[PDB]
């Protein structure tokens, strides 16, 4: 098995697996997530690599349970399910990815950006795209 | 590229990078990038005359 | 190859580190095997670590319920006499390099996994060497779990911690064998020696 | 053209680099030896080298014959850019 | 050749395999609903240890219109007969022993690629 | 010179080996008592092993596969023609001798190649 894709959210004391993050955005459906991540369903080696960190996440399906799962690990976790849900929702809408947009709703593009990150990670893993160089000043300001 | 070389809407500071191995096009307009001027070759001659 | 000489080696020697950067062993062959590389590579294979993943070419799991159905063309099942198997084919060249044979690979698998699994092996004569492994007594994924937990760490042949072994003829006279002749000269000799990449020093 | 037999114990890239480095080192050594043979008895580099006061024959070779091959971490110049060492070169060039 | 992926039609979910303990027929079932389907592949999971897979699948024909790539006239195109075609190596990792060049015809709307 | 036995598994192996000898029409061309030969090989294997365990069954299966394989009918030819004694074929080991010339050649060349593949150290 092994090879589980996870995330390290800001102001969250513990890492969380990815599919819980996607469902926290409200993507309860499963085909939507893989559409966001995999842009072509014809290469089996690419698509099989998400199964490890997809079978790890079948307990959580609804949005509220995902938000509570996130909030249980917050910097100041709530004492009520409403507190956990609102805290996790606020930290996702504000702290996570301000550059894509902090408008009233940005899930339609935040999900695509997370999918792009995961797709890049899988591309690096499969060897279809070499790693980035820290010394290259195209990557510096 | 043509609009930047005419310098009408895209200022000369903007850099357009197109990747071909992966179909991406990247555009940067932020501060801090380091750039130097260079001559332009059209086919095999110079635009400098 | 790499030996990491210089100041880092001095630090490793001064600060006695339970793990160095590049531990290795120089092995001298005792008998006539030190002279013919053919009878030294067998020792090399007896030394180097070899798991199942080193020899496997392709692997696949099928749901063939009827044993005589044989979803793939394999006449061996009929003469040999869970509804799913685990067909494993082995690369021929790697299989021969270790001077190994499937009849004992199956015995290793059976000894490792008890009676939970039953392995059927193709004969050496056939061009394609295959292994039909069937569990007999949530088991759909159990084959995947075991194969991911036996292919990597099986230890078909050799000893652990020895990543690779180099057969080498020394050029300098320091490692060359020295024997005083009958009339009294020194007459340095050249014999095969080996350089591992791990440390056992006891099984070796 | 895939007509390169891998050297015992070496990958294809490793043996390719081995032949390349061997050829380049042979060229450097031969040119240096020719330069040493060319020097006169009144030359000052030769006088200060043979006495061991300063310098060595490699310095004479680099001043006269050829500087040689540069390396970082014991290998030739790495592909700092994408599949090339400088913008003035062309992708996947392993020439001297 | 490979194991495909089938999606549940009701709730848009992965279809897990499920052997029929009575009919001895492999079937695909969801988990969020009592959905069943007939499995025709007769395969579950394959794995190629060698991983020596051809890379022509992802060789985009857009590579031809690139100015920083070599151009040669030694191996012309087979069909259109164009005399010039760019070439490049694996351009990817995992290559145990790869020095061959994957050619692409430098012709508009040709896309002819081959390995030598 | 095959003493008949009473063990059912032994006779099953004998008849399977005999039917294996029926492949390739070599027995028809020669005209020999292949059943007697099968009994002799089974008895020789039993003498070598002194048991009826996994080794018995896998050795019999290996011999059957070697005999009935059509890629090397020469071994069947020269075992039914009396070129090789039955006992030596019984004590035959693996494939290094009961093989065609092409497989022996490819094994030899891969053995020679692994020399260089395992030298290293410049
Ligand atoms: Zn469903
Ligand atoms: Zn063309």
mmCIF file of C-alpha atoms and ligand atoms in Angstrom, chain E residues 8 11 30 33, ligand 1:
data_model
loop_
_atom_site.group_PDB
_atom_site.id
_atom_site.type_symbol
_atom_site.label_atom_id
_atom_site.label_comp_id
_atom_site.label_asym_id
_atom_site.label_seq_id
_atom_site.Cartn_x
_atom_site.Cartn_y
_atom_site.Cartn_z
ATOM 1 C CA UNK E 8 -20.726 4.478 -10.468
ATOM 2 C CA UNK E 11 -23.508 8.699 -7.060
ATOM 3 C CA UNK E 30 -20.227 0.647 -5.403
ATOM 4 C CA UNK E 33 -25.548 2.433 -3.053
HETATM 5 ZN ZN1 LIG G 1 -22.790 4.469 -6.090
#
